[PDB]
């Protein structure tokens, strides 16, 4: 579980060793102290990454690459731009990013994070063609076209599912999957400033910044959710974005804590 490292005592010593390998003087105690957090923050600042103190996959990539971050990784400047376009403080934007985004917008192999929703495939296929063809495709490929919620698999295979659906119809397939750092759904392409789903997907392939800006436009689409974000109404924003059970997952509390730590 070396994916992220906040304030734990673990093989965090390894991290500290690696930090010392790039010009740091951490004690290598194995405990994520404030010294360790400051070293991670320094690495993020040097790489241009989002400065949060969290040893994420992006920070680890920077550490293994001599302080250079991958161009598709989300940067502090990206978050500043998102906050500007949203008219909120950088701290609010950073909190929302920390809580609401998925870890990374791309998988371990660099493929974009995808989840194919087969019931959306069914709805789109039925709407575009006869309900009869929707039923036939349900019978033939129930994993790709199906009235009921999808039979998902691991993250990378979702791209294979998307290609299989595109084999049936490209537009429907691209509209029937969610991509990227905030798992924007394909059919919401126009809401995020794209003419069709395929273009939103391709642009999302450029980097996590496109994901963030599409997410910003998505927030701007919901006037009440945008207002809740502006008012730092964490409970309201969580209810509108995360759903009715936002409390059950401490989403509003997580947003509040992140904001406090980014003041």
C-alpha positions as a LaTeX table, in Angstrom:
\begin{tabular}{lrrr}
\hline
Residue & $x$ (\AA) & $y$ (\AA) & $z$ (\AA) \\
\hline
Unk1 & 0.00 & 0.00 & 0.00 \\
Unk2 & 2.85 & 2.36 & $-0.93$ \\
Unk3 & 0.48 & 4.22 & $-3.25$ \\
Unk4 & 0.20 & 7.33 & $-1.05$ \\
Unk5 & 2.09 & 8.45 & 2.07 \\
Unk6 & 0.74 & 11.15 & 4.38 \\
Unk7 & 1.97 & 10.80 & 7.98 \\
Unk8 & 2.52 & 7.05 & 8.40 \\
Unk9 & 5.29 & 4.90 & 9.83 \\
Unk10 & 6.03 & 2.32 & 7.17 \\
Unk11 & 8.63 & 1.55 & 4.52 \\
Unk12 & 8.44 & 5.34 & 4.45 \\
Unk13 & 12.10 & 4.96 & 5.36 \\
Unk14 & 12.59 & 3.88 & 1.75 \\
Unk15 & 11.02 & 7.16 & 0.65 \\
Unk16 & 13.37 & 9.07 & 2.93 \\
Unk17 & 16.32 & 7.09 & 1.57 \\
Unk18 & 15.24 & 8.01 & $-1.95$ \\
Unk19 & 14.90 & 11.63 & $-0.88$ \\
Unk20 & 18.45 & 11.60 & 0.49 \\
Unk21 & 19.53 & 10.20 & $-2.87$ \\
Unk22 & 18.40 & 13.42 & $-4.58$ \\
Unk23 & 20.07 & 15.85 & $-2.18$ \\
Unk24 & 18.07 & 15.64 & 1.05 \\
Unk25 & 19.24 & 15.20 & 4.64 \\
Unk26 & 16.31 & 13.35 & 6.19 \\
Unk27 & 17.08 & 11.05 & 9.10 \\
Unk28 & 15.72 & 7.95 & 7.31 \\
Unk29 & 13.85 & 7.14 & 10.53 \\
Unk30 & 10.95 & 5.49 & 8.69 \\
Unk31 & 8.49 & 7.96 & 10.27 \\
Unk32 & 6.72 & 10.57 & 8.12 \\
Unk33 & 7.63 & 13.58 & 10.21 \\
Unk34 & 7.22 & 17.24 & 9.41 \\
Unk35 & 10.75 & 17.10 & 8.00 \\
Unk36 & 9.64 & 14.36 & 5.60 \\
Unk37 & 6.52 & 16.32 & 4.66 \\
Unk38 & 8.64 & 19.41 & 4.00 \\
Unk39 & 11.01 & 17.39 & 1.81 \\
Unk40 & 8.06 & 16.06 & $-0.20$ \\
Unk41 & 6.67 & 19.59 & $-0.52$ \\
Unk42 & 10.06 & 20.79 & $-1.75$ \\
Unk43 & 10.14 & 18.02 & $-4.36$ \\
Unk44 & 6.66 & 18.99 & $-5.54$ \\
Unk45 & 7.60 & 22.67 & $-5.74$ \\
Unk46 & 10.73 & 21.87 & $-7.72$ \\
Unk47 & 8.79 & 19.68 & $-10.15$ \\
Unk48 & 5.92 & 22.15 & $-10.54$ \\
Unk49 & 3.46 & 19.60 & $-9.13$ \\
Unk50 & 0.57 & 20.36 & $-6.81$ \\
Unk51 & 2.13 & 21.11 & $-3.42$ \\
Unk52 & 0.26 & 19.05 & $-0.82$ \\
Unk53 & 2.84 & 17.05 & 1.15 \\
Unk54 & 1.40 & 13.74 & $-0.07$ \\
Unk55 & 3.86 & 11.24 & $-1.55$ \\
Unk56 & 1.59 & 10.31 & $-4.43$ \\
Unk57 & 2.43 & 8.47 & $-7.62$ \\
Unk58 & 3.19 & 11.83 & $-9.25$ \\
Unk59 & 5.62 & 12.77 & $-6.47$ \\
Unk60 & 7.23 & 9.33 & $-6.69$ \\
Unk61 & 7.66 & 9.72 & $-10.44$ \\
Unk62 & 9.38 & 13.04 & $-9.80$ \\
Unk63 & 11.64 & 11.45 & $-7.18$ \\
Unk64 & 12.71 & 8.59 & $-9.47$ \\
Unk65 & 13.30 & 11.13 & $-12.29$ \\
Unk66 & 15.55 & 13.66 & $-10.52$ \\
Unk67 & 12.89 & 16.22 & $-9.66$ \\
Unk68 & 11.18 & 16.18 & $-13.07$ \\
Unk69 & 7.45 & 15.49 & $-13.22$ \\
Unk70 & 5.56 & 13.88 & $-16.08$ \\
Unk71 & 3.97 & 16.47 & $-18.34$ \\
Unk72 & 0.52 & 14.88 & $-17.95$ \\
Unk73 & 0.59 & 15.25 & $-14.15$ \\
Unk74 & $-1.52$ & 17.97 & $-12.57$ \\
Unk75 & 0.50 & 21.03 & $-11.55$ \\
Unk76 & $-0.02$ & 23.79 & $-9.01$ \\
Unk77 & $-0.46$ & 26.23 & $-11.90$ \\
Unk78 & $-3.28$ & 24.04 & $-13.22$ \\
Unk79 & $-5.08$ & 24.29 & $-9.87$ \\
Unk80 & $-4.51$ & 28.06 & $-9.77$ \\
Unk81 & $-6.03$ & 28.38 & $-13.24$ \\
Unk82 & $-9.01$ & 26.25 & $-12.20$ \\
Unk83 & $-9.56$ & 28.37 & $-9.09$ \\
Unk84 & $-9.35$ & 31.54 & $-11.20$ \\
Unk85 & $-11.91$ & 30.28 & $-13.71$ \\
Unk86 & $-14.15$ & 29.24 & $-10.79$ \\
Unk87 & $-13.68$ & 32.48 & $-8.84$ \\
Unk88 & $-12.68$ & 30.71 & $-5.62$ \\
Unk89 & $-9.58$ & 30.72 & $-3.46$ \\
Unk90 & $-6.75$ & 28.37 & $-4.35$ \\
Unk91 & $-7.28$ & 26.61 & $-1.01$ \\
Unk92 & $-10.86$ & 25.67 & $-1.93$ \\
Unk93 & $-9.75$ & 24.39 & $-5.34$ \\
Unk94 & $-6.94$ & 22.35 & $-3.78$ \\
Unk95 & $-9.32$ & 20.87 & $-1.21$ \\
Unk96 & $-11.86$ & 19.91 & $-3.87$ \\
Unk97 & $-9.07$ & 18.38 & $-5.96$ \\
Unk98 & $-7.77$ & 16.38 & $-3.00$ \\
Unk99 & $-11.17$ & 15.01 & $-1.99$ \\
Unk100 & $-13.17$ & 14.64 & $-5.23$ \\
Unk101 & $-10.61$ & 13.68 & $-7.87$ \\
Unk102 & $-9.50$ & 10.14 & $-8.35$ \\
Unk103 & $-5.87$ & 9.58 & $-7.47$ \\
Unk104 & $-4.48$ & 10.03 & $-10.98$ \\
Unk105 & $-6.05$ & 10.66 & $-14.35$ \\
Unk106 & $-4.08$ & 7.84 & $-16.00$ \\
Unk107 & $-3.23$ & 4.26 & $-15.05$ \\
Unk108 & 0.17 & 2.75 & $-14.26$ \\
Unk109 & 0.71 & 2.17 & $-18.00$ \\
Unk110 & $-0.18$ & 5.72 & $-19.05$ \\
Unk111 & $-3.59$ & 4.79 & $-20.44$ \\
Unk112 & $-6.35$ & 7.16 & $-19.36$ \\
Unk113 & $-8.52$ & 6.03 & $-16.47$ \\
Unk114 & $-11.72$ & 4.62 & $-17.94$ \\
Unk115 & $-14.88$ & 2.91 & $-16.77$ \\
Unk116 & $-17.30$ & 1.64 & $-19.42$ \\
Unk117 & $-20.98$ & 1.82 & $-18.43$ \\
Unk118 & $-22.81$ & $-0.85$ & $-20.40$ \\
Unk119 & $-26.29$ & 0.35 & $-19.41$ \\
Unk120 & $-25.47$ & 3.75 & $-20.91$ \\
Unk121 & $-24.35$ & 1.79 & $-23.97$ \\
Unk122 & $-27.77$ & 0.14 & $-24.07$ \\
Unk123 & $-29.66$ & 3.41 & $-23.61$ \\
Unk124 & $-27.65$ & 5.18 & $-26.32$ \\
Unk125 & $-27.91$ & 2.27 & $-28.76$ \\
Unk126 & $-31.67$ & 2.02 & $-28.25$ \\
Unk127 & $-32.08$ & 5.78 & $-28.71$ \\
Unk128 & $-29.95$ & 5.83 & $-31.89$ \\
Unk129 & $-31.27$ & 2.63 & $-33.50$ \\
Unk130 & $-34.34$ & 0.49 & $-33.00$ \\
Unk131 & $-34.97$ & $-0.82$ & $-29.52$ \\
Unk132 & $-34.92$ & $-4.12$ & $-31.40$ \\
Unk133 & $-31.25$ & $-3.70$ & $-32.28$ \\
Unk134 & $-30.58$ & $-2.68$ & $-28.68$ \\
Unk135 & $-32.15$ & $-5.95$ & $-27.53$ \\
Unk136 & $-30.21$ & $-7.97$ & $-30.11$ \\
Unk137 & $-26.92$ & $-6.38$ & $-29.04$ \\
Unk138 & $-27.89$ & $-7.08$ & $-25.43$ \\
Unk139 & $-28.28$ & $-10.75$ & $-26.32$ \\
Unk140 & $-25.03$ & $-10.91$ & $-28.30$ \\
Unk141 & $-22.72$ & $-8.77$ & $-26.13$ \\
Unk142 & $-24.29$ & $-8.47$ & $-22.66$ \\
Unk143 & $-20.96$ & $-7.24$ & $-21.27$ \\
Unk144 & $-20.99$ & $-4.24$ & $-23.65$ \\
Unk145 & $-24.72$ & $-3.57$ & $-24.21$ \\
Unk146 & $-27.04$ & $-4.32$ & $-21.30$ \\
Unk147 & $-30.00$ & $-2.62$ & $-19.59$ \\
Unk148 & $-28.49$ & $-3.31$ & $-16.15$ \\
Unk149 & $-25.41$ & $-1.83$ & $-14.52$ \\
Unk150 & $-22.13$ & $-2.87$ & $-16.05$ \\
Unk151 & $-20.08$ & $-5.97$ & $-15.46$ \\
Unk152 & $-16.94$ & $-3.98$ & $-14.77$ \\
Unk153 & $-13.36$ & $-5.25$ & $-14.61$ \\
Unk154 & $-9.97$ & $-3.76$ & $-13.72$ \\
Unk155 & $-9.17$ & $-0.24$ & $-14.84$ \\
Unk156 & $-7.00$ & $-0.92$ & $-17.88$ \\
Unk157 & $-9.41$ & $-3.47$ & $-19.40$ \\
Unk158 & $-12.10$ & $-0.78$ & $-19.50$ \\
Unk159 & $-10.30$ & 0.56 & $-22.57$ \\
Unk160 & $-10.73$ & $-2.85$ & $-24.21$ \\
Unk161 & $-14.43$ & $-2.70$ & $-23.35$ \\
Unk162 & $-14.62$ & 0.77 & $-24.89$ \\
Unk163 & $-12.96$ & $-0.44$ & $-28.10$ \\
Unk164 & $-15.35$ & $-3.38$ & $-28.29$ \\
Unk165 & $-18.28$ & $-0.99$ & $-27.95$ \\
Unk166 & $-16.83$ & 1.36 & $-30.57$ \\
Unk167 & $-16.79$ & $-1.65$ & $-32.89$ \\
Unk168 & $-20.58$ & $-1.55$ & $-32.56$ \\
Unk169 & $-20.96$ & 2.24 & $-32.69$ \\
Unk170 & $-18.25$ & 4.81 & $-32.02$ \\
Unk171 & $-20.43$ & 7.72 & $-30.88$ \\
Unk172 & $-22.47$ & 5.63 & $-28.44$ \\
Unk173 & $-19.38$ & 3.88 & $-27.09$ \\
Unk174 & $-17.52$ & 7.13 & $-26.41$ \\
Unk175 & $-20.64$ & 8.58 & $-24.79$ \\
Unk176 & $-21.07$ & 5.46 & $-22.62$ \\
Unk177 & $-17.80$ & 5.65 & $-20.64$ \\
Unk178 & $-16.22$ & 7.86 & $-17.98$ \\
Unk179 & $-12.62$ & 9.04 & $-18.29$ \\
Unk180 & $-9.89$ & 10.83 & $-16.43$ \\
Unk181 & $-9.08$ & 12.43 & $-13.12$ \\
Unk182 & $-12.72$ & 13.22 & $-12.25$ \\
Unk183 & $-14.34$ & 10.37 & $-14.23$ \\
Unk184 & $-16.34$ & 12.75 & $-16.40$ \\
Unk185 & $-18.91$ & 10.73 & $-18.32$ \\
Unk186 & $-18.66$ & 10.80 & $-22.09$ \\
Unk187 & $-22.14$ & 12.12 & $-22.85$ \\
Unk188 & $-21.36$ & 15.18 & $-20.70$ \\
Unk189 & $-18.85$ & 16.30 & $-23.35$ \\
Unk190 & $-20.86$ & 19.37 & $-24.38$ \\
Unk191 & $-21.27$ & 20.45 & $-20.74$ \\
Unk192 & $-17.46$ & 20.54 & $-20.49$ \\
Unk193 & $-16.99$ & 22.44 & $-23.76$ \\
Unk194 & $-16.61$ & 19.71 & $-26.38$ \\
Unk195 & $-18.67$ & 19.14 & $-29.54$ \\
Unk196 & $-18.80$ & 15.34 & $-29.16$ \\
Unk197 & $-17.56$ & 12.63 & $-26.81$ \\
Unk198 & $-14.68$ & 11.50 & $-29.03$ \\
Unk199 & $-13.06$ & 14.94 & $-28.96$ \\
Unk200 & $-13.38$ & 15.14 & $-25.18$ \\
Unk201 & $-11.69$ & 11.74 & $-24.90$ \\
Unk202 & $-8.84$ & 12.64 & $-27.26$ \\
Unk203 & $-8.20$ & 15.96 & $-25.52$ \\
Unk204 & $-8.29$ & 14.18 & $-22.16$ \\
Unk205 & $-5.43$ & 12.11 & $-23.54$ \\
Unk206 & $-3.21$ & 15.22 & $-23.44$ \\
Unk207 & $-2.95$ & 15.41 & $-19.65$ \\
Unk208 & $-4.68$ & 15.85 & $-16.33$ \\
Unk209 & $-5.09$ & 19.60 & $-16.94$ \\
Unk210 & $-7.79$ & 18.96 & $-19.54$ \\
Unk211 & $-9.52$ & 16.75 & $-16.97$ \\
Unk212 & $-9.37$ & 19.52 & $-14.37$ \\
Unk213 & $-10.71$ & 22.19 & $-16.73$ \\
Unk214 & $-13.55$ & 19.96 & $-17.94$ \\
Unk215 & $-14.35$ & 19.32 & $-14.27$ \\
Unk216 & $-14.34$ & 23.09 & $-13.70$ \\
Unk217 & $-16.81$ & 23.59 & $-16.54$ \\
Unk218 & $-18.93$ & 20.75 & $-15.14$ \\
Unk219 & $-19.04$ & 22.51 & $-11.76$ \\
Unk220 & $-19.94$ & 25.79 & $-13.48$ \\
Unk221 & $-22.82$ & 23.98 & $-15.20$ \\
Unk222 & $-24.54$ & 23.38 & $-11.84$ \\
Unk223 & $-25.30$ & 26.88 & $-10.60$ \\
Unk224 & $-26.23$ & 25.72 & $-7.10$ \\
Unk225 & $-23.20$ & 23.42 & $-6.81$ \\
Unk226 & $-20.96$ & 26.24 & $-8.04$ \\
Unk227 & $-22.56$ & 28.58 & $-5.48$ \\
Unk228 & $-21.99$ & 26.02 & $-2.72$ \\
Unk229 & $-18.33$ & 25.82 & $-3.70$ \\
Unk230 & $-18.09$ & 29.62 & $-3.74$ \\
Unk231 & $-19.73$ & 29.83 & $-0.30$ \\
Unk232 & $-17.41$ & 27.08 & 1.00 \\
Unk233 & $-20.64$ & 25.19 & 1.77 \\
Unk234 & $-18.88$ & 21.84 & 1.88 \\
Unk235 & $-22.02$ & 19.92 & 2.84 \\
Unk236 & $-24.08$ & 21.34 & $-0.03$ \\
Unk237 & $-21.33$ & 20.86 & $-2.61$ \\
Unk238 & $-20.75$ & 17.29 & $-1.42$ \\
Unk239 & $-24.48$ & 16.54 & $-1.54$ \\
Unk240 & $-24.80$ & 17.81 & $-5.10$ \\
Unk241 & $-21.58$ & 16.24 & $-6.42$ \\
Unk242 & $-21.04$ & 13.15 & $-4.25$ \\
Unk243 & $-24.73$ & 12.33 & $-3.76$ \\
Unk244 & $-27.18$ & 11.97 & $-0.88$ \\
Unk245 & $-24.80$ & 9.74 & 1.12 \\
Unk246 & $-22.06$ & 12.40 & 1.16 \\
Unk247 & $-22.22$ & 12.32 & 4.96 \\
Unk248 & $-21.80$ & 8.54 & 5.16 \\
Unk249 & $-18.39$ & 8.93 & 3.48 \\
Unk250 & $-17.37$ & 12.10 & 5.37 \\
Unk251 & $-17.04$ & 13.91 & 2.03 \\
Unk252 & $-17.96$ & 17.31 & 3.47 \\
Unk253 & $-15.70$ & 16.72 & 6.47 \\
Unk254 & $-12.85$ & 15.73 & 4.16 \\
Unk255 & $-13.37$ & 18.90 & 2.12 \\
Unk256 & $-13.37$ & 21.03 & 5.27 \\
Unk257 & $-10.19$ & 19.43 & 6.62 \\
Unk258 & $-8.40$ & 19.81 & 3.28 \\
Unk259 & $-9.40$ & 23.47 & 3.13 \\
Unk260 & $-8.13$ & 24.06 & 6.66 \\
Unk261 & $-4.80$ & 22.46 & 5.76 \\
Unk262 & $-4.53$ & 24.59 & 2.59 \\
Unk263 & $-5.46$ & 27.95 & 4.17 \\
\hline
\end{tabular}
